[PDB]
């Protein structure tokens, strides 16, 4: 749930969604999203968090290689 | 403009626990003083991909939410 909120705040701060959407989405997610819809959201966010992790590794690897 | 994207990306990595403060600081030093033009290009491409993925995620979440509304009918 923390990942969902973080992601949504990031999207808002970058201008991809507005405040109304942040509120509506998070309310829906917590209280009205079905088990299937939650699974859909979680998979999208999970993929994103995995790609972010991978990016971290790539940056760390690039830095390290440059040093030796 | 790409510079702000790099800083955003780095903050994201830090806030998610992928890097620590020492790495962030060293990375900035490395980027400014030691990174080759190729290495800088590699960093910029990684960050661009991340900003595009973030945009895409937004669309996916908005579309999922929209679909959920329609399915109430
Ligand atoms: Mg986390």
Residue numbers in the entry:
A (entry chain B): 533 to 600
B (entry chain A): 531 to 603
Original paper wording:
The Arabidopsis VEL proteins are accessory proteins that interact with PRC2 to nucleate and propagate silencing at the FLOWERING LOCUS C (FLC) locus, enabling early flowering in spring. Here, we report that VEL proteins contain a domain related to an atypical four-helix bundle that engages in spontaneous concentration-dependent head-to-tail polymerization to assemble dynamic biomolecular condensates. The VEL domain adopts a compact globular fold, consisting of four α-helices in a quasi-antiparallel “up-down-up-down” configuration, each of which contributes to the hydrophobic core, as illustrated by VEL1VEL. Mutations blocking polymerization of this VEL domain prevent Polycomb silencing at FLC.
